[PDB]
Amino acid sequence: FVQIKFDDLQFFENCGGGSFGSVYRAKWISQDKEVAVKKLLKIEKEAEILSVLSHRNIIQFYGVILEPPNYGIVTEYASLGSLYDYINSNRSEEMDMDHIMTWATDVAKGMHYLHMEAPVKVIHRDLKSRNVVIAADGVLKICDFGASRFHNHTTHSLVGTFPWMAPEVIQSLPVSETCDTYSYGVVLWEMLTREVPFKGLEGLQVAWLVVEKNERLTIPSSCPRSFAELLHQCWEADAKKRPSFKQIISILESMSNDTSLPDKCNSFLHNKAEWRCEIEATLERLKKLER
Numbered sequence: 001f002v003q004i005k006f007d008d009l010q011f012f013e014n015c016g017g018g019s020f021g022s023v024y025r026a027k028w029i030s031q032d033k034e035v036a037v038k039k040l041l042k043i044e045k046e047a048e049i050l051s052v053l054s055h056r057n058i059i060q061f062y063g064v065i066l067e068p069p070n071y072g073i074v075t076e077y078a079s080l081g082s083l084y085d086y087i088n089s090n091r092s093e094e095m096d097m098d099h100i101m102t103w104a105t106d107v108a109k110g111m112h113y114l115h116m117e118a119p120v121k122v123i124h125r126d127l128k129s130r131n132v133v134i135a136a137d138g139v140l141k142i143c144d145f146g147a148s149r150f151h152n153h154t155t156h157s158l159v160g161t162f163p164w165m166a167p168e169v170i171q172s173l174p175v176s177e178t179c180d181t182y183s184y185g186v187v188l189w190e191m192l193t194r195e196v197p198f199k200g201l202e203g204l205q206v207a208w209l210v211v212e213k214n215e216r217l218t219i220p221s222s223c224p225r226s227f228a229e230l231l232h233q234c235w236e237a238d239a240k241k242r243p244s245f246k247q248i249i250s251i252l253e254s255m256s257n258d259t260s261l262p263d264k265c266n267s268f269l270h271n272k273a274e275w276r277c278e279i280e281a282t283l284e285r286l287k288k289l290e291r
């Protein structure tokens, strides 16, 4: 639990402009490192237990600021921004199957670490594309994995998050590690379609559809069966039927040995002008049904 002085940080944006949980890009002056700083109401000493987590696919802890009223957590800064912002930009047009496979494996490997390999078992509960960021060499890094335990006030809006939330999380039901499998499924769908899940729908409406109606995001008819089946396994209503992250990694490895899949997936990825209408038709249907 290395302490970093507030005076040892150069902030690049003003740090008084955000809600708790806001993250600011900063320079750690004494170490000449670019860092992220999350603003917190206060920091539990017990958060020490997460300070020892370390994996190439999770954001790296650096220290804590402990000078009331200024509290925060300092981590590495991933130079290329959030996965969400990348996906929903025109830059994601450069993604091919090898790109998606690498990034899907990155996130699955970080979550497997959190669930099974870390000194403390971590169930994220808030995994989403805005909580994954891209390092300078393209490695993805999961953020906010300690929020649900140690600074729940940062997480809650909640309406924004309902596309990524497992039904059992939405209902405050018994929750297992496979709530993160469901969320990961959504992140994979975002990478494949490069669309905002349930775009333009009210969050309460999403939660209702997902929980009571077993509604799930539209998988385009031309999506390769291997990806579609993986999405369906992640999205099972019964959380005990969802795959672990070890199983997901195994599936990804089997898909990477399928010599027919690069052509099928790249053709699907570059065919967005044709299948985008299948997603928009579902959204029109869902919006009209609410009316």
Ligand SMILES: COc1n[nH]c2ncc(C#Cc3c(F)ccc(NS(=O)(=O)c4cccc(Br)c4)c3F)cc12
Pocket (backbone or CB within 6 Å): 023, 024, 036, 037, 038, 047, 048, 050, 051, 059, 060, 061, 073, 074, 075, 076, 077, 078, 079, 080, 081, 082, 133, 134, 142, 143, 144, 145, 146, 147
């Ligand atoms: C666009 O936003 C970003 N672009 N590039 C980025 N790189 C890093 C971040 C971040 C972060 C961050 C942070 F500054 C503090 C904490 C956390 N996550 S945490 O609260 O779950 C955490 C992580 C590790 C140890 C402990 Br203790 C707590 C974080 F994820 C955000 C970005």
